[PDB]
Structure 1
Amino acid sequence: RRPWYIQGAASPKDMLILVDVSGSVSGLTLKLIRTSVSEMLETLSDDDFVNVASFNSNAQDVSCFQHLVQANVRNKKVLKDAVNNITAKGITDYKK
């Protein structure tokens, strides 16, 4: 998980985290999903671009970004704060 190892282990990424927020993920799995999303966000550097989206019968962004961002400290903080606010409600739709 060290920055030098991550830099030397692969190439820069254009990552899009897709989060399921349908009703079935309510409970323990939603909290685990939030923690996992934060942990994976912690694996990105300034050369990677990331955005987080959620879908429950309809897909939308979780923050005020609306596209990929540089994934620096401030953007990652915003994404983490937005992610640790989601609620499980609705019906899953993977196509959308």
Structure 2
Amino acid sequence: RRPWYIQGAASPKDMLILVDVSGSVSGLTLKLIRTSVSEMLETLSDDDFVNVASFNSNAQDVSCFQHLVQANVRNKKVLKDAVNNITAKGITDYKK
């Protein structure tokens, strides 16, 4: 997980974490999804770009960004603080 390893082990990325906030993920699945998205963001460096969508019968962004941002310490902090507020309710629609 170290910066030097994750740097020398691949090329810069354009990640788009697509959380599922349907009703069925409510309970323990939602908690594990929050912790997982955070621990996944912690594997991004400053050359990689990231954004966290979220879909439940409607696909919306999870934060104030609406496009791929640079994944530095401040942007990752924004994304984590916005993911920790996710709630689960609705139907699922993978096409949206």
Secondary structure in structure 2 of the residue aligned to 1:53: strand
Unaligned stretches of 5+ residues in structure 1: none
- Give the C-alpha shift of residue 34 in structure 1: 0.2
- Give the C-alpha shift of residue 8 in structure 1: 0.1
Residue by residue over 1:11-58, the C-alpha shift from the partner in whole angstroms, topping out at 9 and shown as x without a partner, is: 000000000000000000000000000000000000000000000000
Task: Give the distance between the partners of 1:14 and 1:90, measured in 2 at CA.
Answer: 28
Task: Give the distance between the partners of 1:95 and 1:83, measured in 2 at CA.
Answer: 22
Moved over 4 A (4+): none
What is the RMSD of the two structures over their aligned residues, measured on CA atoms? 0.2
Q: Structure 1 length normalisation: TM-score?
A: 1.00
Task: Give the distance between the partners of 2:62 and 2:76, measured in 1 at CA.
Answer: 12
| Structure richer in helix, relative to its length | 1
Percent same amino acid among aligned pairs?
A: 100
Q: Structure 2 length normalisation: TM-score?
A: 1.00
